[PDB]
Design a protein around this ligand. Sequence first.
Ligand SMILES: *C(=O)[C@H](CC(=O)C=C(C)C)[C@@H]1[C@@H](O)C[C@]2(CO)C3=CC[C@@H]4[C@](C)(CC[C@@H](OC(C)=O)[C@@]4(C)C(=O)O[C@H]4O[C@@H](CO)[C@H](O)[C@@H](O)[C@@H]4O)[C@H]3C[C@H](O)[C@@]12C
Lengths: 10, 27, 258
Amino acid sequence: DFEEIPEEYL
Amino acid sequence: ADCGLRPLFEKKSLEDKTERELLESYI
Amino acid sequence: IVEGSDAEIGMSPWQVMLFRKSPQELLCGASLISDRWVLTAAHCLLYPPWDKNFTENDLLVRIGKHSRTRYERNIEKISMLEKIYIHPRYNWRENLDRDIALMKLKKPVAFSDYIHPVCLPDRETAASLLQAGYKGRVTGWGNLKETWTANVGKGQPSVLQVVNLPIVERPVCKDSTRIRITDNMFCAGYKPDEGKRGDACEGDSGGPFVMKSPFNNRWYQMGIVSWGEGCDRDGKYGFYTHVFRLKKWIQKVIDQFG
Ligand SMILES: *C(=O)[C@H](CC(=O)C=C(C)C)[C@@H]1[C@@H](O)C[C@]2(CO)C3=CC[C@@H]4[C@](C)(CC[C@@H](OC(C)=O)[C@@]4(C)C(=O)O[C@H]4O[C@@H](CO)[C@H](O)[C@@H](O)[C@@H]4O)[C@H]3C[C@H](O)[C@@]12C
């Protein structure tokens, strides 16, 4: 399932 | 203003593969 | 979406994904209606029977997507929320009446081939197009078959799905169910004798039901995916939030933040 999203979105 | 006009479709006068189904139902 | 197809790229560039930050999950669909405003179902955020009450920092909005699960690296845009607005009379206690919410984005998105807002209806578009037998279109990344009540076959799509559904007469909508149907709803779908089928399904909630005007060739959002009983059951129908009837409230919140 989900690919990791970039850290500046968290 | 340009709402509802899709870059890849209306804006270059291409249809999608099923939009005729919609339009054919509007009597 | 049950019994649909893969969407084409850019076919629905107002589709938004409601994505949970932790654990990272697809919560629901949603709709881009301007550069800093997203429209969704209130139940996506607020559902007290389940202790569901999302707030702005709970969530990400993802715009421009096609693939359900990947990070579409130079295509999709991920946005933060500045404010959530749920209708003051959303009825979670009985029927999901007024199942609508606005979300205002932290910063405006830029439009692209893949990211573009849908129109909202005005009175005469609603009048002309919202009729029985006329088809609209639903999209989303939700389950491919029913659900809670879970399922087999395929389960979850790789890519955005599409289906086109006729609008159904209000009487047959009310006669298919025991729930109280209000004026803030409509239902859609094929009848058991019609041979086509199809429906939304879990994880599709909150997204757009859209129609294309034959007068000016534009796409308008007529509905929000709200509720159904099961997914794609014979003689059951999908129920959608009636977007023109709640438009006063929408204008109210956008004009006065704005
Ligand atoms: C969105 O993704 C989904 C809406 C759709 O899929 C739309 C269509 C098919 C057209 C949403 C989802 O976000 C969560 C729901 C909305 O809040 C949801 C949650 C719990 C359900 C629900 C409120 C409908 C009533 C009830 O179900 C039924 C069938 O009566 C409820 C409360 C529920 O507990 O689910 C039911 O579960 C089955 C099997 O375990 C049992 O038979 C029932 O007794 C039990 O009530 C529902 C509405 C909406 O469709 C959902 C799924």
